[PDB]
Design a protein around this motif. Structure first.
Motif, PDB file in Angstrom:
ATOM      1  N   UNK A 175       0.949  -1.330  -0.373  1.00 21.93           N
ATOM      2  CA  UNK A 175       0.798  -0.198  -0.449  1.00 21.93           C
ATOM      3  C   UNK A 175       0.916   1.656   0.174  1.00 21.93           C
ATOM      4  N   UNK A 176       2.320   1.023  -0.321  1.00 21.22           N
ATOM      5  CA  UNK A 176       2.882   2.575  -0.284  1.00 21.22           C
ATOM      6  C   UNK A 176       3.425   2.648  -1.457  1.00 21.22           C
ATOM      7  N   UNK A 177       3.490   4.140  -1.857  1.00 17.97           N
ATOM      8  CA  UNK A 177       3.749   4.031  -2.814  1.00 17.97           C
ATOM      9  C   UNK A 177       4.858   5.779  -3.287  1.00 17.97           C
ATOM     10  N   UNK A 178       4.979   6.264  -1.499  1.00 19.87           N
ATOM     11  CA  UNK A 178       5.516   7.154  -1.756  1.00 19.87           C
ATOM     12  C   UNK A 178       7.041   7.672  -1.112  1.00 19.87           C
ATOM     13  N   UNK A 179       7.292   6.192  -0.199  1.00 18.64           N
ATOM     14  CA  UNK A 179       8.451   5.924   0.132  1.00 18.64           C
ATOM     15  C   UNK A 179       8.969   4.842  -0.243  1.00 18.64           C
ATOM     16  N   UNK A 180      10.480   5.106  -0.361  1.00 17.03           N
ATOM     17  CA  UNK A 180      10.938   3.955  -0.063  1.00 17.03           C
ATOM     18  C   UNK A 180      11.559   3.257   0.638  1.00 17.03           C
ATOM     19  N   UNK A 181      12.496   1.521   1.429  1.00 18.84           N
ATOM     20  CA  UNK A 181      12.587   0.976   2.347  1.00 18.84           C
ATOM     21  C   UNK A 181      13.375   0.074   1.562  1.00 18.84           C
ATOM     22  N   UNK A 182      14.993   0.879   2.430  1.00 19.74           N
ATOM     23  CA  UNK A 182      16.147   0.141   1.823  1.00 19.74           C
ATOM     24  C   UNK A 182      16.342  -0.936   2.948  1.00 19.74           C
ATOM     25  N   UNK A 183      17.515  -2.140   2.884  1.00 19.28           N
ATOM     26  CA  UNK A 183      17.310  -3.123   3.883  1.00 19.28           C
ATOM     27  C   UNK A 183      18.680  -3.552   4.296  1.00 19.28           C
ATOM     28  N   UNK A 184      19.435  -3.244   5.118  1.00 19.97           N
ATOM     29  CA  UNK A 184      21.226  -3.674   4.859  1.00 19.97           C
ATOM     30  C   UNK A 184      21.482  -4.643   4.828  1.00 19.97           C
ATOM     31  N   UNK A 185      22.470  -5.053   3.790  1.00 23.99           N
ATOM     32  CA  UNK A 185      22.355  -6.363   3.843  1.00 23.99           C
ATOM     33  C   UNK A 185      24.090  -6.966   4.219  1.00 23.99           C
ATOM     34  N   UNK A 186      25.144  -6.527   3.605  1.00 24.81           N
ATOM     35  CA  UNK A 186      26.422  -6.954   3.895  1.00 24.81           C
ATOM     36  C   UNK A 186      27.008  -6.244   2.701  1.00 24.81           C
ATOM     37  N   UNK A 187      28.663  -6.108   3.857  1.00 24.68           N
ATOM     38  CA  UNK A 187      29.455  -5.331   3.951  1.00 24.68           C
ATOM     39  C   UNK A 187      30.081  -5.495   2.488  1.00 24.68           C
ATOM     40  N   UNK A 188      30.775  -4.596   1.603  1.00 23.80           N
ATOM     41  CA  UNK A 188      31.720  -5.298   0.523  1.00 23.80           C
ATOM     42  C   UNK A 188      32.822  -4.142   0.640  1.00 23.80           C
ATOM     43  N   UNK A 189      34.296  -4.632   0.336  1.00 24.89           N
ATOM     44  CA  UNK A 189      35.305  -4.162  -0.034  1.00 24.89           C
ATOM     45  C   UNK A 189      35.941  -4.155  -0.717  1.00 24.89           C
ATOM     46  N   UNK A 190      36.336  -2.861  -1.331  1.00 27.84           N
ATOM     47  CA  UNK A 190      37.148  -3.202  -2.136  1.00 27.84           C
ATOM     48  C   UNK A 190      38.381  -3.537  -2.937  1.00 27.84           C
ATOM     49  N   UNK A 191      39.190  -3.164  -3.287  1.00 25.97           N
ATOM     50  CA  UNK A 191      40.571  -3.954  -4.041  1.00 25.97           C
ATOM     51  C   UNK A 191      41.676  -2.639  -3.923  1.00 25.97           C
ATOM     52  N   UNK A 192      42.615  -3.466  -3.797  1.00 27.35           N
ATOM     53  CA  UNK A 192      43.802  -2.215  -2.918  1.00 27.35           C
ATOM     54  C   UNK A 192      45.129  -2.313  -4.070  1.00 27.35           C
ATOM     55  N   UNK A 193      45.310  -1.593  -4.999  1.00 25.67           N
ATOM     56  CA  UNK A 193      45.990  -1.617  -6.612  1.00 25.67           C
ATOM     57  C   UNK A 193      46.950  -0.868  -6.494  1.00 25.67           C
ATOM     58  N   UNK A 194      48.346  -1.715  -6.448  1.00 24.34           N
ATOM     59  CA  UNK A 194      49.606  -0.577  -6.119  1.00 24.34           C
ATOM     60  C   UNK A 194      50.284  -0.286  -7.987  1.00 24.34           C
ATOM     61  N   UNK A 195      50.930   0.507  -7.776  1.00 24.39           N
ATOM     62  CA  UNK A 195      52.079   1.117  -8.606  1.00 24.39           C
ATOM     63  C   UNK A 195      53.379   1.794  -8.290  1.00 24.39           C
ATOM     64  N   UNK A 196      54.587   1.110  -9.267  1.00 27.61           N
ATOM     65  CA  UNK A 196      55.635   1.593  -8.910  1.00 27.61           C
ATOM     66  C   UNK A 196      56.739   1.052 -10.427  1.00 27.61           C
ATOM     67  N   UNK A 197      57.643   1.440 -10.266  1.00 32.51           N
ATOM     68  CA  UNK A 197      58.367   0.881 -11.135  1.00 32.51           C
ATOM     69  C   UNK A 197      59.123   0.212 -11.127  1.00 32.51           C
ATOM     70  N   UNK A 198      59.335  -0.989 -12.536  1.00 32.52           N
ATOM     71  CA  UNK A 198      60.434  -2.031 -11.979  1.00 32.52           C
ATOM     72  C   UNK A 198      61.385  -1.235 -11.895  1.00 32.52           C
ATOM     73  N   UNK A 199      62.053  -1.553 -10.611  1.00 30.66           N
ATOM     74  CA  UNK A 199      63.237  -1.727  -9.972  1.00 30.66           C
ATOM     75  C   UNK A 199      63.817  -2.842  -9.123  1.00 30.66           C
ATOM     76  N   UNK A 200      64.412  -2.798  -8.476  1.00 30.96           N
ATOM     77  CA  UNK A 200      65.316  -4.094  -7.725  1.00 30.96           C
ATOM     78  C   UNK A 200      64.319  -4.561  -7.158  1.00 30.96           C
TER      79      UNK A 200
END
Lengths: 49, 149
Positions: free
Chosen positions: B46-71
């Protein structure tokens, strides 16, 4: 002593005396410029040098 | 008000269990840590005007690293072992920004980071550039510290 028949062979040519034949006729102009010959350039490098 | 933090000074500390010494390695281009919570939208009858957001699961990103070709460091020798499948060791990573003096103003402190991708830069005959290799890790948890949160 340079005897100006030698000037006609050895000395350079000045710019102020010129005639322009345009098609089948000659038209007296004051200036004339831009008669260049220009090329492009192609290159190539590889990893060995 | 206190001055905001700029983004061109940073240390990274690694701690593997293969390797007895904790080592500190300078990078060029740490990418950036995300953390999403993954809500989902429910629609009620019966509800057409509000929204309902339900929390689930925390997603973590990724650690992307860059460096030169060294020793050969203790970290590029360690990605070589994991990507040859000779070990599956993961490390506790500590990343921290530095202020004008030396002091750590924020710290990010990743846990159980696993080396998952190596990516080499281009070899080009007319290039004028340092050969940069791209490293990428997937971690389990993330815990940010410091005074500038």
């Amino acid at each position: 002593a340079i005897t100006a028949d030698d000037i006609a062979v050895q000395y350079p040519i000045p710019t102020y005396r010129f005639i322009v034949t345009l098609g089948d006729e000659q038209v007296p102009f004051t200036s004339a410029s831009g008669l260049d010959i220009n090329f492009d350039t192609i290159e190539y490098r590889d990893g060995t040098g | 008000m206190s001055t905001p933090a700029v983004s061109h000074r940073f240390l990274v500390n690694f701690l593997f269990n293969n390797i007895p010494n904790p080592f500190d390695i300078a990078f060029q281009r740490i990418s950036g840590l995300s953390r999403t919570l993954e809500v989902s939208q429910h629609r009620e009858g019966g509800e057409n005007v509000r929204n309902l957001w339900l929390a689930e699961q925390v997603n973590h990103g990724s650690l992307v690293l860059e460096r030169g070709v060294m020793n050969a460091s203790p970290l590029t020798l360690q990605f070589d072992r994991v990507l040859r499948r000779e070990s599956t060791q993961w490390a506790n990573v500590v990343i921290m920004l530095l202020n004008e003096l030396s002091l750590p103003v924020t710290t990010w402190t990743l846990s159980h980071a696993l080396p998952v991708r190596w990516q080499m830069g281009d070899l080009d005959a007319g290039s004028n550039q340092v050969l940069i290799n791209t490293l990428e890790l997937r971690y389990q948890d993330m815990r940010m510290l410091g005074v500038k949160l």
